[PDB]
Amino acid sequence: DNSRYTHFLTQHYDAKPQGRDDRYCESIMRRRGLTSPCKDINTFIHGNKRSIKAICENKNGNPHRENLRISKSSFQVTTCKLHGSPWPPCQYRATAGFRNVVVACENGLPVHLDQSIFHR
Amino acid sequence: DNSRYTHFLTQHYDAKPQGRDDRYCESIMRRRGLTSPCKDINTFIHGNKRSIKAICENKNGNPHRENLRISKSSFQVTTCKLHGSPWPPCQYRATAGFRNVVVACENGLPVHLDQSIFHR
Ligand SMILES: [Cl-]
Ligand SMILES: [Cl-]
Secondary structure, three states, rough: OHHHHHHHHHHEEOOOOOOOHHHHHHHHHOOOOEEEEEEEEEEEOOOOHHHHHHHHHOOOOEEEEOOEEEEEEEEEEEEEOOOOOOOOOOEEEEEEEEOOEEEEOOOEEEEEHHHHHOOO | OOHHHHHHHHHHHHOOOOOOHHHHHHHHHHHHHOOOOOOOEEEEEEHHHHHHHHHHHHHEEEEEEOOEEEEEEEEEEEEEEEEOOOOOOOOOOOEEEEEEEEEEEEEOOEEOOOOOHHHO
């Protein structure tokens, strides 16, 4: 049921981050168990869930292509990209960003963040 | 004086666009005289100036790096990228986007759009 959202908070939300350097990334990847094997690129949104959820309604997001929503507002964000062996030690590099994000909502909740916009 | 902004409206604002295809681009590049030589990549923001100007205050934009402002809100937008000869016929390709934009304001006005975010 409503858990893919839970999985989504766990992979793509860190409410209040303490600085956003590479040493940051390496930490939170591990904590959030994205290290076996090493996830090649992952992004975390910051701030509150309030906003993130509202991408799922015309409140803070209009539709976007086929099965995907985009937000009206911009999010502080941090993208961790692995450097090097898909296996730990898995120690990525960090890119702080600020811009709107794209997700799929189901039963009105974010349940997929779309990483394509963060290679760019 | 306050004209670099004028130049900036002329290069990077089209209030209400009639569709955003490649044939669009090719038209508005020419109209707005960006064809001799052909500008390699140019982006136009849509909607009202109201918003765009407000990137220059803590109303709709916080600072961004060194001498550059980013917007809090997202803009409908259209990026024309030249294909092929820097000389006309200059007929580019179009990419419609929606996301926040980065500019430099002077005397509180946008006077530079930053194109780097649109290669990506
Ligand atoms: Cl950014
Ligand atoms: Cl986009």
